[PDB]
Amino acid sequence: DIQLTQSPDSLAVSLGERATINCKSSQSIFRTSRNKNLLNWYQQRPGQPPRLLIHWASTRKSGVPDRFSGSGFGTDFTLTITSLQAEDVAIYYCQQYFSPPYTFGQGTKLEIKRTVAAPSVFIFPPSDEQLKSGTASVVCLLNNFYPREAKVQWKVDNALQSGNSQESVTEQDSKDSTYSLSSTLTLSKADYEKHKVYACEVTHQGLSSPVTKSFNRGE
């Protein structure tokens, strides 16, 4: 099997700047008879199928912007992206088409660097319908922030919570380069009904100081 190693694994590049992604093949993938290095580059945007950018190491597929260019010979290949756009947020994969199995690199995850953007914070009490079932889910939403790093603490009657929440984060948006994040606090109905004040405290670079959103159970 031919092994392809990409570097780096993660790359953060600002809008308008240049990204360099390398692919090292464990053996030559130059087919003499076709006079081609049989390397493909793909872009896979969040929640989308892969898109072919380049084949034969340096031939751009019709409709792919000239911002994308492939170079290299033998075992060392490079994808260069000039004038980085918001819509370039993706994982980039190299693949050899020289000898089966037609192996992929491990991928390079491209982050778009943009200006700091504070999250909008929203809290949602559990629904009456859910409380009937014996469980309380409290949700804290951090909407459209940058960068990714964010701290979310749950406080119930000012007791800091541990072990009883899960976070989920969107991929960077293709247009505004922001993240959104959900923190869900799960309590038994009984535990929920023993406390009054439910609070979500958010720390992020874009905020002057931590922001708290809270509600009083039954108000």
Q: Note the residues at the interface with another protein (CB under 8 A).
A: 1, 40-42, 44, 49-52, 54-56, 59, 61, 91, 93, 95, 97, 100-107, 120, 122, 124-127, 129-130, 133, 137, 139, 141, 143-144, 166-170, 180, 182, 184, 186, 215
Give 9 or 66: the residue with its C-beta nearer to another protein.
9
What value does the CA radius of gyration of the chain take, rounded to a whole number of Å? 24
Give 15 or 139: the residue with its C-beta nearer to another protein.
139
33 touches which of another protein, ligand G7C, Cl ion, none (CB within 5 to 8 A by kind)? ligand G7C
Per CB under 6 A, the segment of 10-18, 28-36, 67-75, 140-148 that binds ligand G7C is 28-36
Per CB under 5 A, the segment of 33-41, 99-107, 118-126, 140-148 that binds Cl ion is 99-107
122 touches which of another protein, ligand G7C, Cl ion, none (CB within 5 to 8 A by kind)? another protein
Indicate which single residue of 30, 56, 97, 104 sits in contact with Cl ion (rule: CB under 5 A).
Answer: 104
**Stretch 73-132 residues interacting with ligand G7C (CB under 6 A):** 97
In sign, the C-alpha dihedral spanning 138, 142, 148, 149 is negative
Which residues contribute to the site for ligand G7C (CB under 6 A)?
Answer: 31, 33-34, 38, 97
